[PDB]
Structures are given as structure tokens and as C-alpha cells.
Amino acid sequence: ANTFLEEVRKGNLERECVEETCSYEEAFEALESSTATDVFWAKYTACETARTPRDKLAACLEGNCAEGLGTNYRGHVNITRSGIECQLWRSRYPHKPEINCTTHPGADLQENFCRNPDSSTMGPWCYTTDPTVRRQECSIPVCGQDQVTVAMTPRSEGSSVNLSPPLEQCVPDRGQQYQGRLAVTTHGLPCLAWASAQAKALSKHQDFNSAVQLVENFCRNPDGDEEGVWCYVAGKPGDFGYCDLNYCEEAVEEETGDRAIEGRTATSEYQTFFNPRTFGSGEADCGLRPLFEKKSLEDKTERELLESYIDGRIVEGSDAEIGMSPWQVMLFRKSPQELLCGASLISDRWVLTAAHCLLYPPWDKNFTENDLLVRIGKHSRTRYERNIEKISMLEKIYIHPRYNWRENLDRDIALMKLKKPVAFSDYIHPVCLPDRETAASLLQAGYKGRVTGWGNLKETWTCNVGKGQPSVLQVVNLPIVERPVCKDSTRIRITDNMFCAGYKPDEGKRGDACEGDSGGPFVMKSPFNNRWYQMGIVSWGEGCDRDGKYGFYTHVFRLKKWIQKVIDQFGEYLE
Ligand SMILES: *[C@@H]1O[C@H](CO)[C@@H](O[C@@H]2O[C@H](CO)[C@@H](O)[C@H](O)[C@@H]2O)[C@H](O)[C@H]1NC(C)=O
Ligand SMILES: *[C@@H]1O[C@H](CO)[C@@H](O)[C@H](O)[C@H]1NC(C)=O
Ligand SMILES: [Mg+2]
Ligand SMILES: [Mg+2]
Ligand SMILES: [Mg+2]
Ligand SMILES: [Mg+2]
Ligand SMILES: [Mg+2]
Ligand SMILES: [Mg+2]
């Protein structure tokens, strides 16, 4: 209904098919459309208990009501029955759909609206954003009626006189300066006693500052980690999981307390905080690319690190240079052959990888020590490079029980273990890591963040037609973004736990904030030591899924002594 000629047949359609009735070969007569016959047919047959009349039908073909069960619906509402965002059809976050993003266009599986594209087992539905629950039915009215399918529930928010109420007030000095009486964890395990028969044994060479007593069995922090509190627990040689509590915003980006000049003459002003035997090497021998840093040759992207230099523009995807991201891991699948996720090479014998792409029972996923393999030093994802890469079998996984896929990616931080030692090389070289007093001072000055990969993050979350995975390694720069800026962009609640980093977005475009890999290298070159310190883990973000948004990455300056307690276990488990 737009031009003169094509509107003429509107009256023809109305008479024969609607009021009276029609068939396929009758329709193909004065309609003149080989494909559009089937669209009508799908919409017509969907009106099951809606043959006649026009007043009672009205909007069954117009697609804004629900009859019988309701396979006619094409209408426009963001939300479902309760109050949860309907996911976009051809997007796949959180839960991946059983019907794919190609086979069936009949019900028109695109954009953030409800449908019924197979058979109504309950009602017409959309996929939830809430990663706990799977599906939920949308309460559309009935054609030629005022009646609703399912009741509405808004889900309130409370504090003053709603909860209980509790008003406990803050904890300073990351749980060193605190006393209490707790007995709970994330999943829920009873904490063991310190002075009894399973704790006192494993304590014969490590750092202490005993300002406090040893208090019975409670979640404590003597060794002085910047995170929280944990207790010992039972099982098949059991692990340690952190007891969860509420915390205040410690301005890690703007730390308060009472052009600039460059450093150069210094090889390494590093901390030897671990003991290379169980933990393995790569504390001293890291952050020193043999091809760039040792030979002392600037890459192209060292002359454009400052936010001050040429103000700012949208920087396009890059084809990387030869061997300029030796820190890289490419985690595959055994049967069938399938690239899954990414990891960051941290030592000669440790693998910091993503946790989301590991344990996720909405995808049916308990693939453990047998069904995995990692590959280091890969430029061509397509080809095989027998020498400059090589194969690396896996050993035990370790969990960080704060890890909550169920809620909102709280700590996407886990660890793997290789069996052999990966030998060092001209192509292969692990990356270093900084602590609180080193990391926080870097982002006082406006220094960019680097990410490399192949867009593994992009492909794993959205089906997304237009652009695809290249053979060549990606590489890209990202400036810094303020705290309340990123907070007032999105309405959904976030924390300092993670952080925001992207460019100034467009109106009519996706953007270039969805590159890299999932659990890949987020690094930054040092101006002091001519070194490379890793300060990020790539997980899910609003920069990919949504438009007009920045990529969302996890912080890593916490959990320093978490690894120190893990390396104790490797010695006793063997033999
Ligand atoms: C449904 O989802 C829409 C996604 O774009 C949003 O609509 C917006 O509506 C506002 C009106 O204040 C416009 O300013 C804006 O251009 C956009 O169209 C919005 O998240 C949501 N809208 C409603 C009404 O629920
Ligand atoms: C995976 O399977 C093992 C084998 O029985 C089971 O014991 C375990 O509970 C599963 N893994 C996890 C993390 O629950
Ligand atoms: Mg008529
Ligand atoms: Mg006829
Ligand atoms: Mg005919
Ligand atoms: Mg005919
Ligand atoms: Mg006819
Ligand atoms: Mg004809």
C-alpha cells in the first residue's frame, strides 16, 4: 500500500479470500507473487479458530493479537509477562536457541519481539536476559477481545523496611581489619576449624603478619590478600572457596592519598614474590619479546598510545605484524575438531583462561580432564605450523567459587594446568603481571589498552552476517573511559569488579569494540621498564551484543596470593 499500481489488488484479495474462502491455486490467479502466497498462507493458517468474521478477526493478518494459542503474533513489545528483556532472535546470549539463526524465516525470527515459531507448549514466547531462567510467555491480548493469558509480576526493589532489614556498614583494608562469626559460602559448605586436624599441617614456608589471633573456624585473611575471606572445606582433597560479603568502591582508577617524563635505562625492576619450582618460571623471564624488546625496536602502535596525540577517531580492524603477541592460547575440542575459547599464557606451566566457556550446564557441559587441548604460538587459524606452534596436553582445572555464571559474571576468573613444560623461543614468550601498587598507577595517565585475536568473542555470541573470521591475527588499541560515564550509559547495575573501555560510537553502525578472543590477551606496554604487563581478561560485554556501547573486561589486580595457595597442592597430589 504505497504506489498506484500495486494497491489495486488490495480490493481483489479482500473479497475472495477473507469474507468467503480460498485455496492455493485460486490465490495464484490475480495475485502475481510466487513467494508472497506462502507468507499469507502461514499467517492465514495460523488463524486456527479465526476463519470469520472481519470484526472478530480484524488484526489476525495485521499481527497484533493472540488467538487459540497464538502463532499469528508479529507485534512490538520489548518485555514479557514479568519484566525481563526479550533477547534478539539471531543473537545468542545468554542461552543458545534450539532452532538456529538461518533455517526458519516463517515466523520472522529477528529483532526484540515475541513469537510462537514451532508449536505452543505453553504460549507465545521470547528468550530471557536473566541467565537463571530459560523461557517465559508474553501476555498479548486476544483478537476481538479484552482478555489476558498470564498474570503480571513486577519484581520490587527494597532496602528501608522491605528486606529484614540489615544495614551492616563497610569493611576497610580488604578483610584484614574485620572480626565476626560467619559460617557460609557461595554454594554453601560448612567451614572447618583451624586448630583441630586439617589445616595446621599445611603451613611450613610462607609470608605472615600476625596482628590478630587465630579465631576458631571463621573466614579470615592473615596472609593479606586484596579481595576477601576463605575457609578450608572437605571432600576428595578439597579446595578453598571465598566466603561472600558486601564491599565499598575503592577508587582503583583515582586513588587518593596526600606530558610527563619517560624512563629507559633499566632492564627489570621486578618483584620475585614466588618460588620457581612448583609455580614454575616466567616471573623474571617474561614481558620481553625476543623479536621486539630484546632487539629494542618499536612497533607501529607505540607512536599512538597517548589520548593527546591527534585527539581521536574510530580506528579500524588491523592485520598484525609478524610475531608481535607471543602471549596467546587457542583452546580446541577433541571430537569433533572445534575451536572453542581463549586463554592467556602466564608462565611455562600455567593457563589463565575464561570460566564461562568451561562449566555452563544450560549448554550441556561437563567436559573435564580428557576432552580438551590447548595450542600456543598460532598465527594461521586455518593452517598447521608444526614447529612454531606445538601440541600441549592438559592436567587439572582449579575453580574460584566466587565464579557465578548464574547471576552476572561475578569473577570470570579460573585456572588450568599443562603437563609438560612449554620451552621458551623466538616466537613463544609468556607475559608478566602487576600488583595493586603497580597496576593502579598506570591508569592515572591516559594510556591505551591493546587486544589481539581473530574476533573469537564476536563469532561465539552473535550469528551476525556481514563480516567474518579472518586468517590473520587481529590487533587494536582502546582509550580509557570514566566511572560514572559508563554507569549512566546502561541502566543495568555494574561494579568496579569489571571495567569499560571503547571508542565514541556512531548512530547507524555496530562499531569496532568486539574484536580479540574470549579469554584472550589484554596487555599494555610499560613506559618504565620496556616491559609488557597483562591487566585484563576478555569476557562478555555490551560492546558486542548491544550497539552504541563499549567492551567489558574483568580486572586482575586482585587474587595475587590466590595462586600462592594453589601451588602448594601440586606437590602433594603427585606420587
Ligand atoms: C524498547 O527498546 C527500544 C530500543 O531502541 C528503546 O526505545 C527508545 O524509546 C525512547 C523513548 O524515550 C527513544 O528516545 C529512543 O529513540 C528509543 O526508540 C527502549 O529501550 C524501549 N522503549 C520502550 C518504550 O519500552
Ligand atoms: C562431571 O562428571 C563427574 C564424573 O562422575 C562428576 O563427578 C562431576 O560432578 C562432574 N563435574 C562437576 C564439576 O560437577
Ligand atoms: Mg470486505
Ligand atoms: Mg474466487
Ligand atoms: Mg488456476
Ligand atoms: Mg482458480
Ligand atoms: Mg479468483
Ligand atoms: Mg494471473
Side-chain angles (χ1 to χ4, degrees), residues 1-5 8-13 15 17-18 21-24 27-28 30-31 33-575:
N2 279 115
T3 196
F4 177 79
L5 178 52
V8 173
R9 298 166 193 76
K10 190 189 285 180
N12 226 64
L13 291 157
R15 296 283 185 274
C17 279
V18 182
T21 352
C22 65
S23 182
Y24 172 91
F28 185 81
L31 199 163
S33 201
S34 300
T35 58
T37 310
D38 302 60
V39 169
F40 175 73
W41 198 279
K43 295 168 72 176
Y44 176 76
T45 319
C47 304
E48 204 286 297
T49 60
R51 288 279 82 84
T52 28
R54 198 261 289 288
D55 272 29
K56 201 159 66 54
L57 178 148
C60 203
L61 304 177
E62 218 170 336
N64 286 94
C65 41
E67 186 62 27
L69 288 152
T71 56
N72 73 277
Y73 188 76
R74 312 289 174 271
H76 299 66
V77 185
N78 293 351
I79 61 171
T80 194
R81 64 155 201 76
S82 59
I84 296 165
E85 280 189 27
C86 293
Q87 188 193 150
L88 304 156
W89 285 107
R90 73 190 190 283
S91 180
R92 308 169 289 201
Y93 177 86
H95 306 128
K96 198 156 60 171
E98 201 174 331
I99 304 155
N100 83 318
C101 35
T102 301
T103 49
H104 255 111
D108 202 74
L109 303 173
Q110 47 200 293
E111 321 314 311
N112 57 312
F113 308 129
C114 313
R115 294 293 190 268
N116 202 142
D118 55 347
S119 278
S120 204
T121 43
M122 282 285 292
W125 50 263
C126 72
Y127 299 117
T128 53
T129 39
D130 196 335
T132 53
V133 76
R134 194 90 182 190
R135 248 156 68 163
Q136 226 169 33
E137 56 259 30
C138 303
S139 185
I140 318 309
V142 185
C143 300
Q145 259 189 326
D146 179 56
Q147 186 255 315
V148 308
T149 60
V150 64
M152 190 248 170
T153 53
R155 306 290 190 181
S156 69
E157 52 191 313
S159 53
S160 191
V161 75
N162 300 115
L163 297 164
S164 210
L167 204 294
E168 206 161 32
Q169 298 204 14
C170 203
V171 186
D173 210 56
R174 306 302 297 182
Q176 282 194 144
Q177 303 297 338
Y178 171 78
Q179 303 284 61
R181 58 193 287 93
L182 282 63
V184 287
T185 66
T186 59
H187 287 290
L189 300 169
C191 290
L192 299 170
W194 290 103
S196 58
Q198 48 262 305
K200 198 181 286 296
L202 300 169
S203 283
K204 87 304 187 70
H205 234 275
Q206 56 271 119
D207 206 331
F208 289 103
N209 185 52
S210 298
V212 194
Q213 300 188 350
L214 296 311
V215 192
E216 187 173 304
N217 71 323
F218 307 127
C219 313
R220 293 280 162 271
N221 193 46
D223 58 302
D225 189 24
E226 304 293 320
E227 170 52 71
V229 287
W230 60 265
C231 62
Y232 283 110
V233 287
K236 292 196 81 178
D239 220 53
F240 69 95
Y242 282 68
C243 320
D244 189 32
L245 278 167
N246 192 247
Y247 299 112
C248 296
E249 299 167 50
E250 306 178 0
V252 72
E253 305 200 48
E254 274 80 71
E255 307 259 48
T256 58
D258 282 28
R259 44 172 50 75
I261 49 270
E262 199 201 61
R264 197 211 283 275
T265 47
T267 57
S268 187
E269 311 299 335
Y270 85 104
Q271 196 84 222
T272 59
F273 213 90
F274 309 116
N275 194 48
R277 212 292 300 174
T278 51
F279 168 68
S281 313
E283 199 177 4
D285 196 42
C286 58
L288 290 170
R289 296 180 290 180
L291 317 187
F292 289 77
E293 268 59 45
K294 289 206 174 292
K295 291 176 72 179
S296 295
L297 300 167
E298 294 203 17
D299 65 56
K300 292 161 186 172
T301 45
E302 284 167 49
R303 74 218 290 278
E304 68 208 65
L305 298 170
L306 304 171
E307 293 182 36
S308 56
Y309 195 80
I310 67 169
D311 299 332
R313 290 191 180 78
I314 296 84
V315 174
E316 198 173 313
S318 202
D319 303 72
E321 306 172 47
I322 198 169
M324 72 166 201
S325 181
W327 35 83
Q328 185 65 61
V329 193
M330 208 161 198
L331 180 48
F332 256 86
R333 206 249 179 74
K334 278 191 169 170
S335 176
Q337 196 262 28
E338 191 180 26
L339 172 57
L340 301 172
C341 222
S344 60
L345 186 67
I346 51 162
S347 73
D348 62 323
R349 309 185 198 184
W350 285 117
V351 173
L352 168 62
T353 193
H356 57 261
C357 42
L358 225 145
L359 276 70
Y360 201 84
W363 283 32
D364 196 283
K365 197 171 280 183
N366 198 50
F367 305 99
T368 180
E369 289 98 58
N370 290 308
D371 307 318
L372 301 167
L373 67 99
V374 284
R375 279 145 78 180
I376 311 157
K378 280 186 65 51
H379 182 84
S380 187
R381 182 173 81 74
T382 57
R383 298 164 52 261
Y384 187 69
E385 313 137 38
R386 90 214 81 81
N387 48 14
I388 62 163
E389 84 200 60
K390 35 178 172 292
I391 316 312
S392 167
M393 279 273 184
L394 290 163
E395 205 171 307
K396 278 298 216 82
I397 307 94
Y398 288 107
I399 314 171
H400 187 256
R402 294 290 191 76
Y403 170 65
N404 287 305
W405 67 265
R406 286 183 161 74
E407 187 171 306
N408 282 104
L409 288 170
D410 176 70
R411 281 88 190 179
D412 195 75
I413 309 171
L415 196 66
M416 287 287 298
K417 183 53 167 71
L418 309 186
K419 197 154 280 167
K420 298 191 191 303
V422 68
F424 305 101
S425 30
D426 295 24
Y427 289 99
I428 319 166
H429 197 93
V431 76
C432 315
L433 57 100
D435 81 283
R436 189 171 182 182
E437 203 168 41
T438 304
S441 300
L442 296 165
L443 299 176
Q444 284 167 32
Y447 279 84
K448 281 170 151 186
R450 189 189 296 270
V451 196
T452 67
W454 298 261
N456 192 100
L457 187 73
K458 196 184 290 185
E459 193 66 80
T460 312
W461 297 128
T462 55
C463 310
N464 218 22
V465 196
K467 306 92 196 298
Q469 291 188 134
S471 65
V472 177
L473 188 80
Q474 280 291 307
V475 55
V476 70
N477 316 55
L478 297 170
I480 312 309
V481 181
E482 296 182 52
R483 176 155 188 75
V485 165
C486 192
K487 286 201 180 193
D488 290 48
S489 63
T490 192
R491 301 152 296 284
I492 293 164
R493 210 68 51 77
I494 55 274
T495 61
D496 62 333
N497 201 50
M498 316 285 291
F499 62 94
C500 312
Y503 276 108
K504 181 159 66 187
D506 301 83
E507 287 175 305
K509 200 65 176 65
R510 168 54 73 84
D512 199 347
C514 194
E515 217 72 79
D517 300 332
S518 175
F522 198 102
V523 297
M524 50 195 70
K525 190 198 170 75
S526 78
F528 300 95
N529 316 141
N530 204 44
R531 262 158 154 269
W532 285 74
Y533 297 85
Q534 174 160 119
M535 261 300 298
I537 300 161
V538 183
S539 186
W540 182 78
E542 296 175 18
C544 281
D545 202 292
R546 298 156 79 166
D547 282 352
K549 292 295 181 179
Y550 322 93
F552 236 95
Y553 318 94
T554 320
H555 259 302
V556 301
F557 85 98
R558 300 198 178 94
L559 314 171
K560 201 182 186 198
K561 284 193 173 69
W562 173 72
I563 304 155
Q564 179 54 37
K565 297 171 279 280
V566 173
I567 59 160
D568 293 28
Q569 296 165 223
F570 185 63
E572 288 199 345
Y573 191 87
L574 300 169
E575 318 296 357

